[PDB]
Amino acid sequence: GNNVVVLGTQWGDEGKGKIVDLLTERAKYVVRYQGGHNAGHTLVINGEKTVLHLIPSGILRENVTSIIGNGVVLSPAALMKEMKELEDRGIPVRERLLLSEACPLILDYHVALDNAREKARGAKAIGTTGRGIGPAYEDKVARRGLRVGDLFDKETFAEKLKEVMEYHNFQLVNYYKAEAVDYQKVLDDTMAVADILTSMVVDVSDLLDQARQRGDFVMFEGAQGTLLDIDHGTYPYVTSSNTTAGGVATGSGLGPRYVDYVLGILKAYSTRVGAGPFPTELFDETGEFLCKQGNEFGATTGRRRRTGWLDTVAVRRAVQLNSLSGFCLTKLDVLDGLKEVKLCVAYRMPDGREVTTTPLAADDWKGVEPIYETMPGWSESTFGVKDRSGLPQAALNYIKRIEELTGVPIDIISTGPDRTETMILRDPFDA
């Protein structure tokens, strides 16, 4: 179909950035619909690396108009920092990026709050990226938050900013005993980039509606992953937005009935950065192997990622929540050399029951044990293979099993960080 959603079926870092950059060759628009700069999407073109955070992954293509939708919490600072970094590399961001006036603004005090809250949790810290994401979504739903639209009146903005900061600082100092955030500083930093930021404003809801009516190709790019979903993830160890497919509509304004295909980015194994339940987590040599071979370190915080086997129980939950149309199996090449590979096919509950369904809130995942199916690995190299024909049978079997267990086909297979180290068996845009 014309409207394709690319999102993470696990705990993020599945390879959304690459696949979005890969598939947008035919797209007219690329749209981020939730999250903020907590995301870290890595693109590699002819060996050249690019890490995006707030800026959509279609920014490297000039035929594409990248769009930061209303569902996104936007940090003017982060935007300018990335804009300048990309512009110095020949990417004219301002010319291909548009954003929603309904976007909530992330400012310094949000970060201070983020840090304070994480501190107060002590050993039970969520392990946020400390980018102020949570607090920004909080001011939004509370209805005191600032939005891009507020910037259109420099005067009234300063007033609104002043009272909201008086509100937060009171808490930062009196309740948390932390430094206060300077009103004037935040006002100046923001005012220094107001004209640039506002010149990219557009009515995204309307734009996407017109694009749909014209049959334009639109790609929605998700951030984080399904199990980090504020509603359906391992609460409270989740992000504060809806990472699941439903967030596409709320975060862009496109009517939900206009989603044609949902592509789940599925990593051949599992990773998680931040605290929280991880049934198939490995602490042995294999885990260490995955981390090393997969270069698993947060593209945003650089923190070492927790590793584990692919979890079919957890992935099946992602199938139903996102009404997945197909998967894109990534980093299959990272498993090369393993004597055997395992995939969780069931959970052994603390009371002894065997289930094929996942617990909701984090607490409920306690004591849950993974039940594995063990398959033969392969010594052959699959790195960069662009044809299923060039893959070992053990790998094909592993692929087929995943499909059988999930009931969803694997339409794309990635064998390397580069845009071309991939094999598209079925393109979402014409499927």
Ligand X SMILES: Nc1nc2c(ncn2[C@@H]2O[C@H](COP(=O)(O)OP(=O)(O)O)[C@@H](O)[C@H]2O)c(=O)[nH]1
Instruction: Name the token pair of 245.
Output: 């497919």
Say how many C-beta atoms besides its own lie within 10 A of residue 26's C-beta: 15
User: Is 129 one of the annotated binding-site residues?
Assistant: yes
What totals of helices (H) and strands (E) does the chain contain, helices first?
13, 17
User: Is 35 one of the annotated binding-site residues?
Assistant: no
In the complex, what is the shortest distance from the CB of residue 131 to ligand DOI, in angstroms, rounded to a whole number? Answer: 5
Residue of the chain from 22, 67, 200, 249 that contacts its own copies (CB under 8 A): 249
* Amino acid at position 267, single letter: K
Residues annotated as catalytic are 13, 41
The pattern of x and - marking residues 8 through 37 that bind ligand HDA according to CB under 6 A reads: ----xx------------------------
By CB under 6 A, is residue 301 in contact with ligand HDA? yes
Residue of the chain from 231, 369, 403, 427 that contacts its own copies (CB under 8 A): 231
Instruction: Name the token pair of 230.
Output: 């504020």
Q: How far apart are CA 36 and CA 21, in angstroms?
A: 18
Tell me which of Mg ion, its own copies, ligand DOI, none is bound by residue 85, counting a contact when its beta carbon lies within the kind-specific cut-off of 5 to 8 angstroms: none
Partners of 104 in beta bridges: 147
By CB under 6 A, is residue 416 in contact with ligand X? yes
399 vs 269, 295, 331, 379, 392, CA distance in Å?
A: 12, 22, 12, 16, 11
- Residue indicated by tokens 């179909």: 1
User: Is 426 one of the annotated binding-site residues?
Assistant: no
By CB under 8 A, is residue 170 in contact with its own copies? yes
Q: How far apart are CA 326 and CA 330, in angstroms?
A: 13
The pattern of x and - marking residues 131 through 150 that bind ligand DOI according to CB under 6 A reads: x-xx----------------
Contacting ligand HDA within 182-241 (CB under 6 A): none
Instruction: Name the token pair of 142.
Output: 């509370």
27 vs 84, 169, 267, CA distance in Å?
A: 25, 44, 24
Total residue count of the chain as it appears in this document: 431
CA atoms within 13 A on the CB side of 9: 32
Q: Candidates 13-21, 150-158, 190-198, 246-254 — which segment interacts with ligand X by CB under 6 A?
A: 13-21
Cβ proximity to ligand DOI, 237 vs 429, nearer residue: 237
Contacting ligand X within 33-62 (CB under 6 A): 40-42, 44
The pattern of x and - marking residues 316 through 345 that bind its own copies according to CB under 8 A reads: -x--xxxxxx--------------------
* Amino acid at position 107, single letter: L
Tell me which of its own copies, ligand DOI, ligand X, none is bound by residue 262, counting a contact when its beta carbon lies within the kind-specific cut-off of 5 to 8 angstroms: its own copies
Rounded to 10 deg, the angle between the 312-322 and 393-406 helix axes is 50
* Amino acid at position 208, single letter: L
Say how many C-beta atoms besides its own lie within 10 A of residue 380's C-beta: 15
Residue of the chain from 87, 184, 188, 255 that contacts its own copies (CB under 8 A): 255
Contacting ligand DOI within 13-42 (CB under 6 A): 13, 38-41
Contacting ligand HDA within 101-140 (CB under 6 A): 129
User: Is 144 one of the annotated binding-site residues?
Assistant: no
Binding residues: 12-18, 38-42, 129, 143, 224, 239, 299-305, 331-333, 414-416
Binding positions for substrate are 299-305
